[PDB]
Design an enzyme around this catalytic site. Structure first.
Site, short mmCIF file in Angstrom:
data_model
loop_
_atom_site.label_atom_id
_atom_site.label_comp_id
_atom_site.label_asym_id
_atom_site.label_seq_id
_atom_site.Cartn_x
_atom_site.Cartn_y
_atom_site.Cartn_z
N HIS B 41 -9.98 6.42 2.26
CA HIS B 41 -9.96 7.65 1.61
C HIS B 41 -10.47 7.54 0.21
O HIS B 41 -10.71 8.68 -0.19
CB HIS B 41 -8.60 8.43 1.63
CG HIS B 41 -7.56 7.90 0.36
ND1 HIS B 41 -6.45 7.57 0.94
CD2 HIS B 41 -7.63 8.24 -0.77
CE1 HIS B 41 -5.57 7.35 -0.26
NE2 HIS B 41 -6.37 7.55 -1.36
N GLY B 143 -3.61 7.86 -8.33
CA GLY B 143 -4.00 6.54 -8.54
C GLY B 143 -3.37 5.32 -8.07
O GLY B 143 -3.77 4.23 -8.45
N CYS B 145 -2.58 4.94 -5.18
CA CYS B 145 -3.16 4.41 -3.69
C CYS B 145 -3.41 3.13 -3.77
O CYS B 145 -4.07 2.63 -4.74
CB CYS B 145 -4.03 5.65 -3.34
SG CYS B 145 -3.43 7.22 -3.17
#
Lengths: 306, 306
Positions: B41, B143, B145
């Site tokens: 993503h 952030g 992720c």
């Protein structure tokens, strides 16, 4: 979002853990530049520990009596010295993995990460707090001695704790990296009184702010209170008295949530006086005091270290 | 002695964290050999996330659209490809710090360590459990992720988790390192139903044993119970049913403490029906289910990894 008890990444500290052996005893040491730091009781036997004369015990030792192993590399000891309760073993080669570091004596109520070690090998890392009575509630088994606690400040490892002993009551005590114990404890195998422990009020309030940031309203009340009157309730429930220095420390959390510190104090006051009624805050059924206000701002802004 | 929620030493994993940026989005990647793994993503915009066609979106991207930052050196991306929900960025140079590692898919109820990261920089480490509903209750901000979860098994890093998303309900979801989500979740910004969560019964018993080892035995009761009769009580309180596999797993703790597994269930049965009455177990006012029986044995024998 979410909130967890988070320890600092331990990579920089792992590179400094060595095994230090003297006679029969093996514990952990800290290798920075060309010096290894370890607890001086490594020069003791089980029976020495009841009442050691450390000066006499160390005089019978020579440089070569100390077996320092860093992983598989054998370090060569070219000097030994006693500074308070720590032993400084001078070795011939500097640790190439030496991080930028300083030695720091922390205040009761501050937090740090512990890298628990056995025979010089890291096994785990966890966060903890130096209690108001200068103890720590940690996880140290036989041979964990010499494990250190630290904070990371950007790129600088700040060593603040070296573990030395378990008190008969099960709590833990140790020194700064200059060998001065936190609290009244001594490295001798006798019964030793820790003080009455108290809850770190400023930390509990910081955690309540962390709760609001993450969606828990329920303890928020219609009341407020005064600094003087809150401390009356604090003394009754064995919370540390709040000072204006503490209120100032909570400024940023105050500003992000829009909740004045004395309004949060009033919410806490009701919590002490009426309990939690079997509901929870950030998943916990008790009031948590092991997050400093800095810990809360770090976890709610994402401060990194590289 | 003592017991803590302890994470694995993070050094070997820190060396593999990089920063991966695409368009406006910056998250974390895992650099092993000459491949960077990160959530696919990263190639989406805020609006793309509503319903991404990942095949078409990745077709439009070029190598130079991926800015991979490792400390101060920027790595050169010479390939990009999709494996399920993870993106594989082939880079010019192999990571010299690559540990021995494997990719592992864990079971609900197992635990692992999380290295929480922002812009490729390690910021903290904590232990966590994969819930029975395949979510994790973690601490992930914007952030984070691409942060990964892992275990160490002697010398080999076992990567088991990559973080991808926060659900609207605040819990977290992510994939194995092959890009297959745990649970029913998908990488698209829509409302997603997590299952009914249950408490991990075998973990709670392991922690009760950890309690006895460390001196807390007030909850020990004088009774027993049968596997069938315990699970009847467990289902009423949303505990996972106990199987014989679970009883067998608790064997070693049984033998060390002298408390048969079914006697400990009887203690737990009483604990569920009458609560804790304001006592604590290992400092906690709730029943803890984030330690596996293996976690308890590690911390109570002092198994190291270096």
């Amino acid at each position: 979002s979410g909130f967890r008890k988070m320890a600092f990444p331990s990579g920089k500290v792992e590179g400094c853990m060595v095994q230090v052996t003297c006679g029969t005893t093996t514990l952990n040491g800290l290798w920075l530049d060309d010096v290894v730091y370890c607890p001086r009781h490594v020069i003791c036997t089980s029976k020495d520990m009841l009442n050691p004369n450390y000066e006499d015990l160390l005089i019978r030792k020579s440089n070569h009596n100390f077996l320092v192993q860093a992983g598989n590399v054998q370090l060569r000891v070219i000097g030994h010295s006693m500074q308070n309760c720590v032993l400084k073993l001078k070795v011939d080669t500097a640790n190439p993995k030496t991080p930028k570091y300083k030695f720091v004596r922390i205040q009761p109520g501050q937090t740090f990460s512990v890298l628990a070690c056995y025979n010089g090998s890291p096994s785990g890392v966890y966060q903890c707090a130096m209690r108001p009575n200068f103890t720590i509630k940690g996880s140290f088994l036989n041979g964990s001695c010499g494990s250190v606690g630290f904070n990371i400040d950007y790129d600088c490892v700040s060593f603040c704790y070296m573990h030395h002993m378990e008190l008969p009551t099960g709590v833990h005590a140790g020194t700064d990296l200059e060998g001065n114990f936190y609290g009244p404890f001594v490295d001798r195998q006798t019964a030793q009184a820790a003080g009455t422990d108290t809850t770190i009020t400023v930390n509990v309030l910081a955690w309540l702010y962390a709760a609001v940031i993450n969606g828990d309203r329920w303890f928020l009340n219609r009341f407020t209170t005064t600094l003087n009157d809150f401390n009356l309730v604090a003394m009754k429930y064995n919370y540390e008295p709040l000072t204006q220095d503490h209120v100032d420390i909570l400024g940023p959390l105050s500003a992000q949530t829009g909740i004045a510190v004395l309004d949060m104090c009033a919410s806490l006051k009701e919590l002490l006086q009426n309990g939690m009624n079997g509901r929870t805050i950030l998943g916990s059924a008790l009031l948590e005091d092991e997050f400093t206000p800095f810990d809360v701002v770090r976890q709610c802004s994402g401060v990194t270290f590289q």
